[PDB]
Design a protein around this ligand. Sequence first.
Ligand SMILES: [Mg+2]
Ligand SMILES: [Mg+2]
Ligand SMILES: [Mg+2]
Ligand SMILES: [Mg+2]
Ligand SMILES: [Zn+2]
Lengths: 36, 146, 229, 95
Amino acid sequence: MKRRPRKWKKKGRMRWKWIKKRIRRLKRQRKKERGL
Amino acid sequence: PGKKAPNGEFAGRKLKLKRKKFRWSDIRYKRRVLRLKEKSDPLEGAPQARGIVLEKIAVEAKQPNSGMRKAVRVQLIKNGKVVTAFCPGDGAIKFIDEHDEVIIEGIGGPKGGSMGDIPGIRYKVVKVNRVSLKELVKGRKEKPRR
Amino acid sequence: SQEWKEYAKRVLDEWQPKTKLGMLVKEGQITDIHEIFRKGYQIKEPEIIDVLLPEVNARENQEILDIALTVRMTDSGRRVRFRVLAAVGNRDGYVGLGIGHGREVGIAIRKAINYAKLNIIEIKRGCGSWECRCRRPHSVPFTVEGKEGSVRVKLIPGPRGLGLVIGDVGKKILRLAGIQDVWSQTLGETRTTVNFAKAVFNALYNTNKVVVTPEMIERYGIVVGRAMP
Amino acid sequence: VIRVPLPEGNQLFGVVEQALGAGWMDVRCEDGKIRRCRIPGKLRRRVWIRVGDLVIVQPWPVQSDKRGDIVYRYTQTQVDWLLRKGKITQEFLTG
RNA sequence: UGGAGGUGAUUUAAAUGCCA
RNA sequence: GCCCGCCGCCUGGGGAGUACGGCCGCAAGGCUGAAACUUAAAGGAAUUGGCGGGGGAGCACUACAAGGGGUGGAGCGUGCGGU
RNA sequence: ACGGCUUUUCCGGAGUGUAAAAAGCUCCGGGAAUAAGGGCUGGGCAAGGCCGGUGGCAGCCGCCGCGGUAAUACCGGCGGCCC
Ligand SMILES: [Mg+2]
Ligand SMILES: [Mg+2]
Ligand SMILES: [Mg+2]
Ligand SMILES: [Mg+2]
Ligand SMILES: [Zn+2]
């Protein structure tokens, strides 16, 4: 997914392992629901 | 890290290709060869414009300031788009009536964009009915069309 | 040149030295500024320079580069103390540069001017440009470089009449030493005058670390110290 | 007599229903049109406004529909004091 | 004088903060 | 560290590893990858202090442990909030 | 404030100039007479620690930043600085 290590730093944001998991759940809908 | 990649005598082509390919990682040169300012720009490469006012509004200043800054909604002529302009001077909002032909400049901030606490305004009125707003605000001249 | 030559005759009495160079000077043995340097001594009494370079205190051979107040926090507020940077030198062949610290501005200035006499050096001058080929001591004899902090400087000779083209706090140091024409090329962050000043000082020092032949001397005009004042 | 924030100039009486958020206050005045008050920066420090506090605001001649602006509050020693004079009828607060 | 690794253990509940 | 070679990548923080289009895979997914717009800082290594439901050393009847007398419940004296 | 002086520029007049004009240039008569604005005045950046308004409002602000009833920073008056 071509990640960049500046974003695991947790200073003023939320965990990256849990943001990726939420980008995926949207790319699953833009694809089923007429991502055809 | 090594020394530097194509430092040969007969290595011109690879050198020119390297430089030409890493020039695009810039942002001022890219924004220029593609001509991206235009076709995203309501004034279309001009230093003024002329519009017709639609209403009068006021905005809130930024976080560590307090006040309301007066402004107007202008609709252009050459395009038909709608921009938000700002009236400079103590008591200017008392001259801009509806249905006026105003002139429009930039505002001169960083990168051509906005400035100061007024965060999203990027144009300022100069002329109202062909009488410099600067004069009107301080007497010294009379206003046409009522 | 008189008032700054009775000054030494006044100082030379009420001064009973404690180091050894003090004895040597006060007994008429050592009698000229050019013979305490290249021999490995130590200099801890600031009256030695008042006697051999009595002009170093003339208020037009003095200079106050920057003043800045710094802070450290404590459970009863902030404790604030100053820092001054000052340079001194006759405008002929000698310079010095020091810092000093205090809790007011006259005391910091006093210590700075003091420690700027115990950090004195002599340089080499000449004329090594490609345009001017006279033999007169107005410029650096050949390009030198000195580094400090995060700031690299490089000083290039320049033709007679062209002024001093360097930053702001380089001009004072290079004017107090006698140089009058120069060019320049720098790097790093040149907004922290402490590091910029120390790099210029180190370059002027490194002037005398380049090997020369006895014939290169009568082609650039290299004078060491005074040159017929 | 007494110094009370009467309607001076063009003031309005603000009695709020709900705070949608970020300072917007839906007010329910005797005028009828849903007005939406906002707040200046001089009082956002020392005072504390909520629902049921009849207070004074100021409207704006633009559309005369969703307007109002706090300038001063009312203390519990005035809110019901303002009944006997009948300057305001409280049945604009129970329907 | 001064540091680098390893294996063990580490104990009921216990949240939140005008304005200058 | 001082030199002689070759190849890969970087150009303020976000938007974004996202949209669109291709090539792989049975599916999960992988590789390639922008612009509108928004913002004056985001980041690094060290220094005084303050703090820790971190560690050591030492304290104190406005702390405890061992003890003596009580205030908190009733009526009045006096001070305060509110009305 | 008194005494004198000049006529580049300004009004009339004569030559010359020009395809014809006009400008221009040489001579005459009057007259110091006909002729300075624009922007800045907290730091970067030369220049005020003065007077009167305004009270987080009005306004200023390329960036940093002023204004909360004692404003060198906003609006004026008087001073000063660069062209
Ligand atoms: Mg990294
Ligand atoms: Mg907490
Ligand atoms: Mg002024
Ligand atoms: Mg200045
Ligand atoms: Zn020379």
